[PDB]
Amino acid sequence: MYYFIPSWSGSGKRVWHRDIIPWYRSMQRLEFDDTIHQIRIFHSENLPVKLLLQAYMPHARYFLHRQDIFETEYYSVFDEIQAVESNDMQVLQIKDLEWEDDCEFIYTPFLIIVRRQGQLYAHVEFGVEGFISFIKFFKDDQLEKLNIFDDRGFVSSIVYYEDGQEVCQDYLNPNGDWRIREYLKFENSHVVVNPVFSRDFDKLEYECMPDLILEKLGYYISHNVEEDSRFVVAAQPFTNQGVLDLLPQHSHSILSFFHERNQASNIENLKADLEYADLVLTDRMDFKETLQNYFPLQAEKIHYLSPFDTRLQLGKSQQRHESKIFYQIDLSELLNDYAIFKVLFYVAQHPDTELVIGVYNAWQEGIKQVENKVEELISDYLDLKDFIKKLEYRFRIRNITDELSLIQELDDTRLIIDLSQQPNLYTQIAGISAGIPQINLVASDYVTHLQNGYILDSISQLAVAADYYLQGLKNWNQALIYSIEKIKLNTGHQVIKRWEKWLKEAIDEK
């Protein structure tokens, strides 16, 4: 069986605590997490797989539903702490909570306000799907308590504040009783167990919560995982030691690097994880390059490889008159003004094309940047008249924040352009799945020149590649063929094949 250890951490000083965010500050995203996408693959191939959840996730069920990995069996370290012996969901109504008898409830486009004789009493808050998330309690206009709710329907933990400052946190059990209390001040930064529960904990007091966590999870790995099991660890940007050390000697490890998590990672801090691990996966050609060049002793086991499935989802672009061009912009780089222009120039001079400039997960600052740079560049070099479709214009800018929306865009798309240094892997994977030829500036496993795609010597040569697929049908039909060959050669079945192969070579070369 495969075991997946995610890195589903928080942003605060307490990594192992998940951010609690009201619905109206949860921006909708296309989560590119390796572990999510690697897991979906396992379900797709109907294979056994378990999640070892290191962190404290009171809303882990709604999190799991939103990533369409609800199905996944998980062991939760914090639920062992809190003695949660059921995943039986029981979604709580506003009414079935213990309220003083004189409480008046005021509704808001954002939350609910509870008052007791006109006095502030509680802010009641909700998550993405309208489950009670947390209630904020008050004592004369100061924050007394914060009751964090579990999405299965009971208060998970309680934060006690003094003078608007975190003091301590009481992780409860489904009945109500504190199992542990973590102190949250600089003063005391450690965790003490309720004596009634000495059965369940080794010590009665811990220096850091990362002790408790690594205690319980360490026990599970040495008492429930059968021999030969495989472990996939999402590399933390720092040492993954307090986890890689808990793994049996009769196991195999994969260290997976996700670029959004590992881009500014403490590179030398991982010296030893790269020495432990059987396989090391990243999503960036250049992350691979650095690892190899920084640590030659591990160079051979580091692999660039997509965590994204290639389905078969051929688009209907032959059923179309205008050639639709999907241009992938990476907002993480500086915009390449020459390259944006070169795509705009091409579309400008070809009335039977249209353009979608696509970006993923964009702040609307970043949208205003992409919009303004095209108005600026069209203004400063081209005639906006030529973009009028013979007051509707032949280019737009699409912020993609859904997987279903990218598919929808790509269906009738006829050509993909990604002029970036690191061509966006996901678009490459969804493009293959739709049979769209892909124009690209740098070579890649996933776009092979004059096969499913054209690799430019230079941005200076874009038109030649665009003419190649848009003039006639010959070249584009041939490319469609090679994208099917790439489609079959990179499905879920094909990923775990590649994983399992790389592994069995590491076993063998010893």
Side-chain angles (χ1 to χ4, degrees):
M1 162 146 81
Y2 272 64
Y3 291 101
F4 280 81
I5 311 180
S7 181
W8 300 342
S9 35
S11 313
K13 55 144 191 163
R14 302 188 288 152
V15 55
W16 45 268
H17 195 302
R18 292 259 315 194
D19 298 21
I20 319 297
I21 280 153
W23 66 279
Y24 55 68
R25 272 306 275 100
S26 300
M27 300 301 136
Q28 192 184 70
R29 273 183 48 100
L30 212 175
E31 203 28 64
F32 284 127
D33 204 324
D34 45 340
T35 295
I36 284 155
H37 283 87
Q38 293 164 331
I39 278 173
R40 307 218 266 233
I41 294 208
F42 270 69
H43 299 323
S44 160
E45 286 317 285
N46 219 282
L47 292 188
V49 51
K50 194 157 193 165
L51 218 45
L52 306 179
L53 306 196
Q54 233 169 305
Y56 163 62
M57 330 172 51
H59 318 341
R61 278 132 299 287
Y62 282 103
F63 170 82
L64 280 176
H65 192 251
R66 277 191 304 266
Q67 306 305 326
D68 210 35
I69 51 176
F70 189 113
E71 31 191 314
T72 313
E73 235 162 82
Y74 60 97
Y75 158 63
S76 148
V77 152
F78 269 76
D79 292 319
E80 202 186 0
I81 293 158
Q82 301 173 244
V84 197
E85 296 158 335
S86 209
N87 296 174
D88 292 16
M89 306 202 36
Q90 183 199 1
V91 61
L92 293 172
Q93 286 305 316
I94 328 179
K95 315 253 159 233
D96 57 76
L97 289 169
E98 31 169 296
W99 301 106
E100 299 218 358
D101 283 318
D102 39 335
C103 292
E104 99 185 345
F105 298 92
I106 301 106
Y107 287 69
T108 296
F110 289 90
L111 45 84
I112 311 189
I113 298 189
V114 186
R115 302 213 287 159
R116 257 209 66 255
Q117 311 280 11
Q119 298 285 317
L120 189 58
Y121 179 85
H123 288 172
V124 185
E125 287 259 44
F126 313 92
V128 185
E129 297 84 5
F131 55 95
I132 291 171
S133 186
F134 57 94
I135 301 162
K136 285 214 243 190
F137 287 111
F138 296 95
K139 253 173 155 91
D140 211 281
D141 291 8
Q142 289 308 315
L143 178 59
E144 193 195 353
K145 309 194 300 189
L146 166 74
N147 282 347
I148 283 89
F149 282 79
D150 192 284
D151 57 17
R152 313 162 201 116
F154 62 92
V155 315
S156 188
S157 37
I158 307 183
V159 189
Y160 299 97
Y161 289 94
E162 68 191 24
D163 298 280
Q165 169 129 335
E166 286 178 353
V167 177
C168 77
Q169 211 175 340
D170 272 355
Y171 297 89
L172 307 195
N173 83 71
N175 192 42
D177 320 283
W178 65 289
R179 310 264 307 177
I180 57 166
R181 168 174 279 184
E182 144 172 38
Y183 291 101
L184 287 163
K185 214 171 304 187
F186 183 51
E187 219 178 27
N188 330 91
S189 286
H190 76 320
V191 177
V192 48
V193 183
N194 177 13
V196 194
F197 301 106
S198 322
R199 266 181 264 89
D200 304 14
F201 297 80
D202 291 4
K203 307 178 189 216
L204 277 147
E205 216 183 90
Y206 297 90
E207 268 202 276
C208 46
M209 185 67 85
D211 296 330
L212 200 37
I213 297 163
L214 298 185
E215 178 189 308
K216 306 256 146 268
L217 164 73
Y219 191 92
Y220 186 101
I221 293 175
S222 38
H223 292 89
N224 316 81
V225 317
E226 310 278 278
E227 291 217 340
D228 229 334
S229 274
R230 277 109 180 133
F231 284 86
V232 189
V233 187
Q236 295 293 354
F238 42 90
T239 39
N240 310 279
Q241 279 299 323
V243 154
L244 281 189
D245 263 340
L246 293 59
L247 295 192
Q249 309 165 341
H250 288 1
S251 69
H252 310 92
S253 52
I254 300 169
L255 199 48
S256 167
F257 291 99
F258 172 31
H259 172 79
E260 280 160 59
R261 190 187 49 231
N262 293 156
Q263 71 161 245
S265 99
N266 200 336
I267 285 323
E268 175 150 274
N269 196 265
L270 318 158
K271 189 164 179 82
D273 298 317
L274 282 88
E275 298 184 16
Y276 185 85
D278 291 310
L279 204 52
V280 165
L281 299 176
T282 184
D283 46 356
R284 291 270 306 216
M285 298 179 65
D286 59 328
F287 205 62
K288 172 163 117 70
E289 171 96 24
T290 307
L291 301 168
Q292 299 188 290
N293 276 334
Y294 202 93
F295 300 116
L297 279 190
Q298 335 296 341
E300 298 207 34
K301 66 170 113 176
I302 290 136
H303 291 116
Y304 171 75
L305 175 88
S306 153
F308 301 118
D309 220 50
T310 84
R311 301 90 157 195
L312 185 71
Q313 308 153 187
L314 292 199
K316 289 137 198 147
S317 70
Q318 303 116 306
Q319 294 208 295
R320 282 266 267 139
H321 204 238
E322 308 85 10
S323 291
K324 162 141 155 195
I325 297 184
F326 184 101
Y327 179 34
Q328 188 59 229
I329 286 322
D330 173 31
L331 256 187
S332 282
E333 76 207 350
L334 71 145
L335 293 205
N336 187 338
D337 274 24
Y338 180 54
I340 300 175
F341 151 70
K342 213 70 171 55
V343 182
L344 290 161
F345 200 46
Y346 192 85
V347 175
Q349 321 203 104
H350 295 84
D352 56 26
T353 67
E354 38 184 30
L355 193 48
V356 188
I357 322 191
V359 282
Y360 295 114
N361 301 334
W363 292 280
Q364 326 318 289
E365 164 282 307
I367 299 301
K368 214 169 300 203
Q369 292 222 301
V370 166
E371 277 155 7
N372 289 353
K373 185 55 81 183
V374 312
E375 294 180 345
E376 143 178 352
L377 285 155
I378 290 173
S379 160
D380 302 6
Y381 296 82
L382 314 168
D383 193 341
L384 168 85
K385 274 307 185 335
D386 307 24
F387 289 99
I388 299 197
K389 17 199 195 160
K390 331 169 294 183
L391 246 190
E392 273 87 343
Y393 296 89
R394 295 168 40 230
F395 72 90
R396 31 174 200 87
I397 289 158
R398 181 82 198 258
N399 186 22
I400 314 270
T401 62
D402 321 79
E403 307 198 81
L404 188 120
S405 267
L406 181 83
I407 304 184
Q408 276 170 324
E409 293 282 345
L410 287 208
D411 204 43
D412 57 338
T413 300
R414 183 77 182 181
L415 186 56
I416 288 162
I417 298 165
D418 179 306
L419 299 159
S420 300
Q421 274 308 131
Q422 169 75 56
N424 173 290
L425 209 31
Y426 193 81
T427 67
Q428 296 195 309
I429 287 307
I432 302 171
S433 311
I436 324 190
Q438 303 201 39
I439 287 174
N440 271 176
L441 182 51
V442 67
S444 181
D445 311 355
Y446 292 88
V447 163
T448 293
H449 183 52
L450 273 193
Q451 283 193 178
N452 82 301
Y454 200 118
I455 314 290
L456 298 162
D457 294 18
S458 82
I459 304 195
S460 148
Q461 285 136 36
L462 179 72
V464 154
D467 298 330
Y468 186 78
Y469 298 117
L470 308 159
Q471 277 170 358
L473 307 173
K474 194 174 95 160
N475 294 334
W476 187 112
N477 268 1
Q478 191 75 59
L480 175 50
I481 286 183
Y482 284 98
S483 182
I484 311 174
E485 307 202 347
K486 225 92 182 198
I487 215 153
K488 291 155 90 204
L489 263 61
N490 287 285
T491 63
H493 209 79
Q494 297 288 323
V495 155
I496 305 138
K497 258 209 292 149
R498 241 184 299 260
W499 285 14
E500 283 298 344
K501 182 227 181 64
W502 289 320
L503 280 189
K504 291 165 181 140
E505 280 146 308
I507 292 160
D508 202 66
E509 289 193 7
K510 309 204 146 302

